[PDB]
């Protein structure tokens, strides 16, 4: 759930070759890749399986913009802990896309292929600094106060 050694704690042996972190809105997804037979499963769960079915189409964005020959064969096991629900999906999306990037590895212009994915979706390779703010004395919420009786 919170920054633990859960990065690889669940799996023993079968060392998965790639480790790639994806993070959106306090949700941690470490991507493990073994370059198999088209296993893109994340959270030990199918790509088609999702909390919001409509949201799955967004998490298939590297698949549509980047060549499918990449996702045609690969292997994946991702530990996603934290996040409300939709936070987990973008974090997952950051993880898998970085996981494909880690696989490209040797070609020096790996970034150039990845930037087609940034151009279609920025933050698909970048992590946002957006985090929950805090309340202050007299304030029910972070950026408000008890309604003021007199101006």
């Amino acid at each position: 759930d919170l920054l633990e050694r859960n990065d690889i704690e669940v799996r023993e042996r079968d060392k998965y070759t790639v480790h790639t972190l994806g993070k959106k809105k306090n949700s941690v997804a470490v991507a493990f890749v073994k370059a198999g037979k088209g296993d893109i499963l994340v959270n030990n769960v199918p790509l088609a399986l999702v909390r919001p079915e409509i949201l799955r189409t967004k998490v298939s964005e590297p698949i549509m913009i980047l060549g499918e020959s990449l996702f045609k064969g690969l292997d994946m096991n991702i530990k996603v802990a934290g996040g409300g629900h939709v936070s987990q999906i973008y974090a997952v999306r950051q993880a898998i896309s970085r996981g494909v990037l880690a696989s490209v590895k040797d070609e020096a212009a790996r970034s150039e292929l990845r930037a087609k994915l940034v151009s279609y979706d920025r933050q698909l390779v970048v992590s946002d600094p957006r985090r929950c703010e805090a309340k202050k004395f007299g304030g029910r919420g972070a950026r408000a106060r008890r309604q003021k009786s007199y101006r």
Binding site: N44, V45, P46, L49
Partner: protein
């Protein structure tokens, strides 16, 4: 695994139709009269609510496996909040008696054999439930 690939909704609904032919568990009468939960607005109208709950506990049980889920644990999967009060609602548990019967009955069928902190599936049951999933996906 295909038990993580069978969508939870499809697995649970499909499993209970042959459980109805099976005659496993035997949902009692007072339980089918009572409303589930201490926060539910009124009784669920599923009629076969007890039988449908029995397909709900043993699927989440496959994922829980060795760690185990006690009586409170399956109530957690269906935990709700009261929708009718002048003051704000603080979250509360569902009914303990109905949940205590569903896995105690499941111990009786030998699919679940448990002796640890609360409940764990007998391997024969884990395999068989997984086998129902094996039928479900392909």
């Amino acid at each position: 695994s295909s038990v993580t690939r069978v969508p939870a909704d499809v697995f649970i609904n499909s499993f209970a139709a042959h459980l109805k032919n099976r005659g496993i568990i035997k949902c009692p009468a007072f339980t089918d009269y009572v409303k589930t939960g201490v926060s539910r607005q009124y009784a669920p109208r599923d009629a076969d609510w007890f039988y449908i709950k029995a397909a709900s506990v043993i699927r989440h049980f496959y994922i829980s496996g060795s760690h185990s889920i006690g009586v409170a644990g399956l109530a957690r999967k269906y935990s709700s909040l009261q929708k009718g009060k002048t003051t704000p609602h603080h979250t509360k548990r569902a009914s303990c008696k109905v949940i205590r019967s569903i896995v105690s009955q499941f111990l009786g069928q030998k699919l679940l054999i448990a002796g640890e902190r609360g409940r764990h599936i007998s391997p024969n049951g884990r395999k068989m439930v997984e086998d129902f999933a094996e039928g479900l996906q392909k």
